[PDB]
């Protein structure tokens, strides 16, 4: 089922030491250099299917701090909507953790209704799908108080 036909990229977790290393990810087929950021998992709206502004949540990093990569759960809405919504909230990149343990998948763009078509052309933030294992590892680091920093490389596209 061409289940290993994904365009994979590498990312690097640079901290904490417990989970530091190189991990495979799959860049979204939408949007699109190296970018270092720090990962945040929101306490609400964790699938990024509704506007973060309804929650008064912003991921805009303060001057002098690292850009925010928002960790989002797969499910309930299109991947492209998750990226758009994370982008509207000021995130510098989105990491979508797969909801099941499986080979990486490619986030594809849907065919939308006429009234919901124009946002597809306006997605700019880097978007990557990561495994449930890595998502779970990052969430565990964050819940214990660690800073999770990450370098994204999309030169491989």
């Amino acid at each position: 089922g061409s289940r290993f036909v994904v365009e994979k990229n590498n990312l690097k977790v640079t901290s904490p030491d417990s989970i530091k290393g190189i991990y495979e990810c799959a860049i979204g087929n939408f949007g699109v250099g190296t970018l270092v950021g720090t990962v945040v998992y929101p306490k609400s709206n964790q699938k990024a299917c509704k506007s973060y502004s309804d929650f008064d949540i912003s991921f805009k990093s303060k001057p002098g701090r690292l850009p925010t990569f928002v960790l989002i759960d797969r499910g309930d809405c299109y991947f492209t909507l998750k990226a758009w919504i994370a982008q509207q909230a000021g995130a510098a990149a989105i990491l979508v953790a797969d909801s099941k343990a499986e080979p990486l998948i490619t986030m594809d763009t849907p065919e939308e209704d006429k009234s919901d078509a124009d946002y597809l052309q306006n997605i700019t933030i880097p978007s990557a799908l990561i495994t449930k294992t890595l998502g779970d590892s990052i969430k565990s680091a964050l819940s214990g108080g660690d800073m999770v920093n990450m370098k994204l490389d999309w030169t491989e596209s």
Binding site: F4, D76, I105, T106, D108
Partner: peptide, 5 residues
């Protein structure tokens, strides 16, 4: 392996 959701 392409998925919309």
């Amino acid at each position: 392996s392409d998925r919309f959701v």
